[model samples]
Target chain A: MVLMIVSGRSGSGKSVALRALEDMGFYCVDNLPVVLLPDLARTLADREISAAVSIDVRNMPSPEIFEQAMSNLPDFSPQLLFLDADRNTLIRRYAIDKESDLLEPLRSRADLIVDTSEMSVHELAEMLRTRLLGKRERELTMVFESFGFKHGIPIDADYVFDVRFLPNPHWDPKLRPMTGLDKPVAAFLDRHTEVHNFIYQTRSYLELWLPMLETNNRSYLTVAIGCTGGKHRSVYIAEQLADYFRSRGKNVQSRHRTLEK
Target chain B: MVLMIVSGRSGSGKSVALRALEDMGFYCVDNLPVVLLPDLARTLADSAAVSIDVRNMPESPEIFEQAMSNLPDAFSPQLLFLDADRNTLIRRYSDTRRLHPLSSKNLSLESAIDKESDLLEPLRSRADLIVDTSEMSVHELAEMLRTRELTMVFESFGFKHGIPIDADYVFDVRFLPNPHWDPKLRPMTGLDKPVAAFLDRHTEVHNFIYQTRSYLELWLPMLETNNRSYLTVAIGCTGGKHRSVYIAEQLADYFRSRGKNVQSRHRTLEK
Candidate 1:
């Protein structure tokens, strides 16, 4: 079991680091106490789960107690990572005075130390992914999000694909109330040659640039597909895109904004 | 002479915080190394603010500590540290999409942040005042340094659109009568006197406003202790144009009357 222990000062980007690890498929726990580390490690070890735990100031026992707990852990050799920022940055980030301090022993024992005083979350994730995982095949996460043009484009999308040019399933009396996730609506869009062509071309376009996007060191990419209502064609195409990416052995998540709500 | 050593993560608004100090007549220097601390403190006149970030930080804490210890007693330097939560730090960094000081292909942004925390642990432990900036804005930080007051953001949004991502509190006002249902009020917004008069006539709207405002007032003291320099409360309705807007305005007025620093925004109206 590859166990990673993430520790940092409050407001020092420990949570951001842990989230990146979680996205990379590490089973992550936040604010876990030092005493529980060994047991948690043993439990996950038995289950063959790779895990990451974040130990913050709140999770820590007394400095002496934490050190003793660390020494007593049986055969659990975990990689320790310490995250930190300057006091001013931490204060501005959390809006507190006399912010909580991590124990000195924990800082001294860390296998790796990251200075996140100047880094963003994306840069932090990339740093952790490369150093911790050791050049492992890091899957690029693809977010296939469906939306309505009326509601406005997702501001964060790397690519926005319009499916409004395709046939509208909203016009069909049988499909008016139903969403793209429904079988009847899916069949209706699936039967259209234009829909197939649009899907094929979009897939081809994305696949061509997939290597470049992944190579750019971005943790994830959001591809937004939009139709008039966000219920029919957009959702259908997003689902189709998710499947295509998944079949290609990529990490994919499908989100239907209007339909799900 | 009084010297202030300000240190923090890069995006934690050190520049803004220092600027606030400078505006108040303190001599300011950015990114000064630890080795120069004693000289800077000795040379400055009445008040001086010098910022030391990770880049100029000494490799060893002992060396920095030694320099700090050697400073003349007359200087009596006060150390101020600034920080923010990971999400806020990430958001700020992502907004600029700039390279971090320690970021590399082998070192993730997270690792660098952790590494920085580790590297600066000595300074952090000894800091006179450590500020957590997770909930503060540049303006808020500046104002806090000036007056030591809290900043409040009143945001009104439409539920049909989506919840505001940064809202700390969200109240649903869809239970109130929607002005969209009335043809005359449909074209007019909550900003209009006609719509305001219509909402004023309804006892339910008034009750909802009073009750919700009272609920917030009751809990306001508790929230004040959380050390947040800025707070955002979102009032959401079916369409942000009418009910949410009027309620938010009233709430802003109420808070302002109580001498709280308040600012209001309408998400749907802005669109």
Candidate 2:
């Protein structure tokens, strides 16, 4: 019975996140008192039920009493999740000045942080679904990003491949307006033997060394593919690489930095 | 039906703002081709909000202007332009580490911004409203457009993380003894009893809180008179999980008990 503790400042969408988790099938309890943490964990454990609980400023008692209760918590570590927003975001959501001191302990212990300041409720649900459940799988999540070398490399990328050496689609008046995601660009890239060879070699190289990278136990690996404008070859190659990895049942996320607004 | 044409520099919260309008019942379309603006306006009959920015800006701005001029008389187009100071825009782009669309081999971020400013100048000059979003958070921008309400927020953050851009005022509380030094209290936060007691035992902490509260109390009335719908006070500590959190909690309680509409948040503690 794994325990998931949801906590955050007021108006940071704690309730929304809890509801989403509930929808995902966790037996959830909102506003569970700090003192009852041990008992609740025991109950969930005994019943063999995976449970989630939300504790915030409103329900927390004095620090001393809460500390005593926290000390008595079950031996197993709970998946503490914290939610937060920009201060302005919180104020706008609730239409009042909101504050909380009760979430610090839980916040410090959180295994995941969901910042809802920039996300809609729907986006939050998707984020939680991907990040929370995705983390539980304990696999190396690969993110393939396409970029334009002219715009500069993504600073977070663990690996960067320059596909500018390939043919220039921008020179072709017809393909200049189309992105790599478009069928025409894909068809153009498909007509080239060098593109196939590059894809096969890159994919083969990643396959050969990815296991070693996985053994390092990093949670994420960011692979970047760059072209002159990021609209053509890099984008096509990134998509293909992402497809290759997805076919292997690996967790993969692909993004076009230039194409996205 | 109101046709709100949303345009902004990259990283200026355009999409987030548009989605908020969508939720508020405006039919929203992102990146509708510039030439189709008149057609979409007539089709939706003023119920649509269209986003046009550098991403979808046509090769010729003259064509876009021509299309706008051709819109039906029943459809009034309101250009809502969003902008931020250069520094804030750079900071956001760097934080995300994403490249700017206007940037190229020859065009640096600085140059791109300058070029972008030039490109959007015509539309900006004609804007019904230009929202300077350098100091506003995404939610604040969304709400500022969606509703009219006064909101006060006390947010705690860590100095380790860069200072929050939207903070109207920032207070540093790193002078107090750190709970992190104690092995037993290392993993615990300000909300834990031992950590709270450790902080409360210090006269300096209390003095700081009192002084800070007094300072805010003295200036809050002036801020209220300024007529802005939102104000954010940021409290920062070394890690944002301890002293800042404790102080924010105490201050919120202090103000709420005094009938002030106040709220608190812990930025570093959350994620």
Candidate 3:
């Protein structure tokens, strides 16, 4: 049984790592509880490489008891790989989309830390497959966020604002709650002074604060803005922020968290 | 502002109550966290006759505190209204192709009791209005539990093999008896006449049942002590049928006697 323990800071391509493992026929589960591992591994003892459970702080607090559990395994010892990146790139990545990093259980206790801010998803996926595959490490992890705004701005948002100031969707009633994913919401939001100015100002603040937050080693940032209940205006603005950041080719999850929620 | 709480043993029409509340212009939020209640009430304080929230064990434990925090408004008092039904209802509901009751805390019918042990127990302990919806249909109770299709289900089993990960009180019947032990009773089931007859005829079994019943009754309330929100009682046997089923039914009735919202699931692989 391949009891690979995937652990790393959030948004560090944990999901991508799992995807790579999946391509390799490793059965994977996300945010698996560490405590359940010993029992689960025992259950899967018959299979040569049955499964790999992902563990991170998202589920439980860590310095995870998993490492010790690994030592107790009777037959096979699975690989433990940790995907890593510098604080600067991670913060910049999060700054563009204004997201918090994927939290991990025991970030400091990593066996392998790959600096990935400069790497593409394809490259990172390959790196994970090569560096950690079949290796006798005790833990491993990857991160990704399928962020959508309608889900409500992330709880980890750093600064949220109303872009309705720039565009008057509430007046239209029809396009009021639609998202930037909709062409109308995009077209409507694209024509606003307040929208553009807000984006510019917010971008400037993030630029200034990104380094400060990085220096302080902040783990997450949450920002929320409501425009007539956070439907259209906020969606466009959040997307613009995400785009601005990603244009620099930085890592970020464009979260229109509230638009859907 | 109208602060309404629609709670029921799973499948007792809490959703119907919520929908009725929604149709009545009560801004309803389904499966809201109990811990966020005071804050939610506060947030919607300005709205007239606004509907707030309800669901299984609260995912957000602080919702109720948030609602209670809204109490000092001097004008608006949050109304606590709950719905309930029979013990076998949850299992029946889960078996039905409808909805499975959801809690803000992210647990389903069975596990919510486990996860929100502190909250449900207390609510069960100090409930203000408990409505029995076992006899009520979705339309019949729409004015009460919301009657929406969002939460529908039938025949959920609370097994000890997996002893629902969140159960607070896991009662092991493995030591007591095994209906599967009897060849004639093996093919028969918890609901079958022979199985019921066997348990009814056994003098020692009756005593055990009575004793377990009393202990569960007493322990369940204890589980709800000091403003606790939820409580999960699991009756586990080798197979989830005979003893577990009978006991879950009885304990559910016992809780129902006190107030509201007690549910059950009898999981069987074949059935």
Candidate 4:
């Protein structure tokens, strides 16, 4: 969580920068006085959230108060971003057309300053998208689960795939007592091409349709893998798919119902 | 602003319930002094929840009822009480909270719980929503706290900054005249007197505003009927400080004048 204090001169593109902050899911405020910094952050932090505020000459407090406020900011870890531009360009196109002085006190304390003169507001947004929004943006998490068909298919699953098509390792006397979680049982399942083939095709199928799911306001997708006892093949396949997705840097988690119960 | 008073037995999972209420963006207070009920409500600008337990209860039942009755009628006050079985309260108390001895008062755990049960009985009887959390987990209870009705959001963003993700619909106001090029209006925003006056000079701007309003008016009823929590109509232009902001303000003002719960936000303006 961060308290992004965005500052810029009247005509230096603070609008787009604050808009970018809003896009990052920060509860954005405009023209917040240097005072009340702690109150806003503490309120949001107390509620388990973060926020951003834009500051400028308009609502800024005296220099002494600004410094005091900065020094005693809350656990929100306030970070200042200054958007500035060439003086000639700023005067040339001051959107407010009225002349206004820049906030030098805030600009001096900025953690990062970008010369917005060289970029369009759209380019500024993309720059923020790459610098900050990438990690903060919410993404769909893929929850993969393994369950026994005997216990009934997981009612919560959005998509179910039967992995019993692979050979049953339970019939084999050596792996009978062990579950898919055991590495030895995993090696046994790995020995069969059919098991690997099932995983490969399933992965491909999920990969193909994932964008549709991701784009449709989905927060979580439950993909269930089922086998006879839910202890062997389904568990292995679920683990494999979960691992593959996690390796691809997706938010993923694996669960085995019967094993846990 | 919404006024919700949360009351429950101390061990009935009020902490998690209030936390969930906080997560849903309600201003939440724990163990607030009963006398400050109206003051607290007046200080807050939006929805608020205050959790009342035996600790914060007035010494007398009549005093508590008097305080509850004094809350402003305009807030549409609601009371939510969480209840749990005695067995569950005992187990939960065993794990936490001063071991429920009621030591100084010379009351045992069972007696203290019974006392608490008695103290909250009046409020529970009057609660608008009562939920029993005997078998519920903190995680499950979190979801039970979630609820909202439809609200309109007229957000103005700049196409240069990209469309807002939460926008249910996006409209382009770039076709209108450029106020930025007008030397007199250059530095002013759509919020300024002259900038608004300058934009309205063009009949096309007024036409776009009314026509667009008409288009949304055609379907706003069904959209509300669908019971969606928010209907965000994003208006955008080249620079968000001018045209789009003006249009959104006008639309928001119009809707509110007609008794809609509207929140207008100009995304790319300094204000």
Model 4 stretches with alpha carbons more than 4 Å out: A1-261, B94-96, B99-103, B147-271
Residue-level lDDT of model 1, residues B67-105, one tens digit each, is 787787677778888988754554455211222322232
- Against the reference, the lDDT scores of all candidates come to 0.74, 0.74, 0.52, 0.74
True-vs-predicted CA distance for residue B67, candidate 1, Å: 55
Question: By summed lDDT, which 10 consecutive residues of candidate 1 chain A come out lowest?
Answer: A94-103
Q: Please rank every candidate by TM-score, starting with the best.
A: 2, 1, 4, 3
Per-residue C-alpha lDDT of model 3 across residues A1-261, encoded as one tens digit per residue? 456667665557666776555445554545444454565555456645546666654444334355575557666566666666666765665442222243443555556667777887756865665565443233211111224344454455456554444656667878755665688876564544345446655655665666666446455545555555555666566656654543323344455445345
Candidate 4 global TM-score = 0.30
Query: What is the C-alpha DockQ of each candidate?
Result: 0.01, 0.01, 0.01, 0.01
User: What share of the reference contacts survives in each candidate?
Assistant: 0.00, 0.00, 0.00, 0.00
Candidate 2 residue lDDT tens string, A15-40: 77775654444656556546556765
User: Which lDDT tens digits does candidate 3 get at residues B1-271?
Assistant: 4455555444445545654764676655443334434444554444322223223344444645554665546335434444453333433332211122221223233443333334455454445556655566556665333322011111224354576665666667666556666799877766677787777676777777678667765655434423445556667776676766765666666556656567666665445
Quality class of the docking in candidate 1, CAPRI style = incorrect
Interface RMSD of each: 17.9, 18.2, 20.8, 20.0
- Write one digit per residue (lDDT tens) for candidate 4, span A84-112: 77777677655443323447678678898
For the predicted complex of model 3, DockQ is 0.01
lDDT of 2 by residue, B47-163 (tens): 667787765566476987788888987866778888998656644542111133222322345655667778787778888777788889767888887762456889999998899
What are the chain B TM-scores of all models? 0.52, 0.51, 0.40, 0.51
lDDT of 4 by residue, B146-213 (tens): 74257899999888788899999999888888887779888788989898988889888889989998
Candidate 1 lDDT (Cα, 0 to 1): 0.74
Stretches off by above 4 angstroms in model 2 are A1-261, B94-106, B148-271
